Design an enzyme around this catalytic site. Structure first.
Site, PDB file in Angstrom:
ATOM      1  N   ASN A 126       0.704  -1.157   0.138  1.00  0.00           N
ATOM      2  CA  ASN A 126       0.037  -0.051   0.040  1.00  0.00           C
ATOM      3  C   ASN A 126       0.878   1.062  -0.040  1.00  0.00           C
ATOM      4  O   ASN A 126       2.030   1.363   0.677  1.00  0.00           O
ATOM      5  CB  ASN A 126      -0.749  -0.120   1.148  1.00  0.00           C
ATOM      6  CG  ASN A 126      -1.988   1.044   1.188  1.00  0.00           C
ATOM      7  OD1 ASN A 126      -2.669   1.213   0.225  1.00  0.00           O
ATOM      8  ND2 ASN A 126      -2.313   1.732   2.427  1.00  0.00           N
TER       9      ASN A 126
ATOM     10  N   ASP B 189       5.828  -4.324   2.420  1.00  0.00           N
ATOM     11  CA  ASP B 189       4.765  -3.962   3.073  1.00  0.00           C
ATOM     12  C   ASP B 189       3.606  -5.034   2.830  1.00  0.00           C
ATOM     13  O   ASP B 189       3.795  -6.143   3.248  1.00  0.00           O
ATOM     14  CB  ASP B 189       4.278  -2.765   2.246  1.00  0.00           C
ATOM     15  CG  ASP B 189       3.139  -1.842   2.869  1.00  0.00           C
ATOM     16  OD1 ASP B 189       3.331  -1.273   3.992  1.00  0.00           O
ATOM     17  OD2 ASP B 189       1.804  -1.978   2.478  1.00  0.00           O
ATOM     18  N   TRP B 190       2.523  -4.666   2.578  1.00  0.00           N
ATOM     19  CA  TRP B 190       1.444  -5.895   2.258  1.00  0.00           C
ATOM     20  C   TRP B 190       1.669  -7.013   1.433  1.00  0.00           C
ATOM     21  O   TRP B 190       1.338  -7.928   1.460  1.00  0.00           O
ATOM     22  CB  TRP B 190      -0.275  -4.945   2.014  1.00  0.00           C
ATOM     23  CG  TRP B 190      -0.558  -4.505   3.296  1.00  0.00           C
ATOM     24  CD1 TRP B 190      -0.696  -3.249   3.663  1.00  0.00           C
ATOM     25  CD2 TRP B 190      -1.057  -5.041   4.397  1.00  0.00           C
ATOM     26  NE1 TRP B 190      -1.161  -3.037   4.777  1.00  0.00           N
ATOM     27  CE2 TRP B 190      -1.348  -4.316   5.434  1.00  0.00           C
ATOM     28  CE3 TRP B 190      -1.141  -6.486   4.562  1.00  0.00           C
ATOM     29  CZ2 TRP B 190      -1.694  -4.612   6.748  1.00  0.00           C
ATOM     30  CZ3 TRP B 190      -1.695  -6.924   5.911  1.00  0.00           C
ATOM     31  CH2 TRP B 190      -2.148  -6.181   6.797  1.00  0.00           C
TER      32      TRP B 190
ATOM     33  N   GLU C 210      11.158  -3.611   4.521  1.00  0.00           N
ATOM     34  CA  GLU C 210      10.035  -2.918   5.191  1.00  0.00           C
ATOM     35  C   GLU C 210       8.767  -3.676   5.121  1.00  0.00           C
ATOM     36  O   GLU C 210       7.769  -3.369   4.510  1.00  0.00           O
ATOM     37  CB  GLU C 210       9.978  -1.300   4.295  1.00  0.00           C
ATOM     38  CG  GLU C 210      11.006  -0.628   4.917  1.00  0.00           C
ATOM     39  CD  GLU C 210      10.808  -0.200   6.316  1.00  0.00           C
ATOM     40  OE1 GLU C 210       9.653  -0.019   6.583  1.00  0.00           O
ATOM     41  OE2 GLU C 210      11.642  -0.444   7.003  1.00  0.00           O
TER      42      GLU C 210
ATOM     43  N   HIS D 262      10.598   4.041   4.342  1.00  0.00           N
ATOM     44  CA  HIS D 262       9.293   3.014   4.124  1.00  0.00           C
ATOM     45  C   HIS D 262       9.510   2.540   2.593  1.00  0.00           C
ATOM     46  O   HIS D 262       9.920   1.217   2.288  1.00  0.00           O
ATOM     47  CB  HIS D 262       7.986   3.071   4.392  1.00  0.00           C
ATOM     48  CG  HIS D 262       7.011   2.047   4.291  1.00  0.00           C
ATOM     49  ND1 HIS D 262       7.377   0.754   5.153  1.00  0.00           N
ATOM     50  CD2 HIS D 262       6.286   1.644   3.770  1.00  0.00           C
ATOM     51  CE1 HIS D 262       6.573  -0.154   4.629  1.00  0.00           C
ATOM     52  NE2 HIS D 262       5.718   0.508   3.817  1.00  0.00           N
TER      53      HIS D 262
HETATM   54 BR   LIG Z   1      -1.194   0.119   5.105  1.00  0.00          BR
END
Ligand SMILES: [Br-]
Ligand SMILES: [Br-]
Ligand SMILES: [Mg+2]
Ligand SMILES: [Mg+2]
Ligand SMILES: [Mg+2]
EC number: 3.8.1.5
Length: 295
Positions: A37, A107-108, A131, A271
């Site tokens: 995301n 991330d996701w 990350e 990030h």
């Molecule tokens: Br998120």
């Protein structure tokens, strides 16, 4: 190098009634790059080139993101983790990946990738992560700078912040990249979310899924499962650490450092590190794949 041009043109596959988009270049066993995301395959545009000739380079756009179709009906209950997984499991099956997949995740994309690996362990040749959401966390483990904003996204304030003001795309994204982005780069990230309303729902449903302080219980259970598994898996790993980093710091970074058969490097970034140190990331991933696929 840096640059705003995408890595290739999107191809499409029909999944459960929706068209999903992905980049697919080259030939050989897959090297699968998965964004999270509020990004899309575009995130990896300057990293994938480093793996030219090493495999079939693939980067999928999650449902409702990038150039993959939006779900309708959409609302507070849409785009949860399990729905993303349902669509992504199907696309990955449709891609005919075989059993020597190298996952490159963020991330996701890491929560989805780690979960898929736990469930298809024999088909995973190696995992490169950065990350990531490597385990359930507490607020105390969340980056101090955005703690209040993320608590806000998880409250009823989220609809205004995201569906109306598009704050994840307009503020969190550039706020977690050290260098200023060009208009073309920002245009690429804004594109799937230009329209006010439900079109932006994925970027609001995602922060509401992060496993923090035990909620949502379902995603906390999933992350607990893949964390327990990774910590014991002999599968080769490449931990692309970042400084100052954001999510994979403190407790979570200490936990990732206990994972077996792992190589590590550190690059500059917060990030969305792919925008700050693409060549350092790409080079290490290429070196990792060459080790896994001795030519
Ligand atoms: Br998120
Ligand atoms: Br819950
Ligand atoms: Mg259609
Ligand atoms: Mg579109
Ligand atoms: Mg911390």
């Amino acid at each position: 190098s840096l640059g705003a041009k995408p890595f290739g043109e999107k191809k499409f596959i029909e999944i459960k009634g929706r068209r999903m988009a992905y980049i697919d270049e080259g030939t050989g066993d897959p090297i699968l790059f998965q964004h999270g995301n509020p990004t899309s395959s575009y995130l990896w545009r300057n990293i994938m080139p480093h793996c030219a000739g090493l495999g079939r380079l693939i980067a999928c756009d999650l449902i409702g993101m990038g150039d993959s179709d939006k779900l309708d009906p959409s609302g507070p209950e849409r785009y949860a983790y399990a729905e993303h997984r349902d669509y992504l499991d199907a696309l990955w099956e449709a891609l005919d990946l075989g059993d020597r997949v190298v996952l490159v995740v963020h991330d996701w994309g890491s929560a989805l990738g780690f979960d898929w690996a736990r469930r298809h362990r024999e088909r995973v040749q190696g995992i490169a992560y950065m990350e990531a959401i490597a385990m359930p966390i507490e607020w105390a483990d969340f980056p101090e700078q955005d703690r209040d904003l993320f608590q806000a996204f998880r409250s009823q304030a989220g609809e205004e912040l995201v569906l109306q003001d598009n704050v994840f795309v307009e503020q969190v994204l550039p706020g977690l990249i050290l260098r200023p982005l060009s208009e073309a780069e920002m245009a690429a990230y804004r594109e799937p979310f230009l329209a006010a309303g439900e079109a932006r729902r994925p970027t609001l449903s995602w922060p509401r899924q992060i496993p923090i302080a035990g909620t949502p219980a379902d995603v906390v259970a999933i992350a607990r499962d893949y964390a327990g598994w990774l910590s014991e898996s002999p599968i080769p790993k490449l931990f692309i650490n970042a400084e100052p980093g954001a999510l994979t710091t403190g407790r979570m970074r200490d936990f990732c450092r206990t994972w077996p058969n792992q190589t590590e490097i550190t690059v500059a970034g917060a990030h969305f590190i792919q925008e700050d140190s693409p060549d350092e990331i790409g080079a290490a991933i290429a070196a990792f794949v060459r080790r896994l696929r001795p030519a």
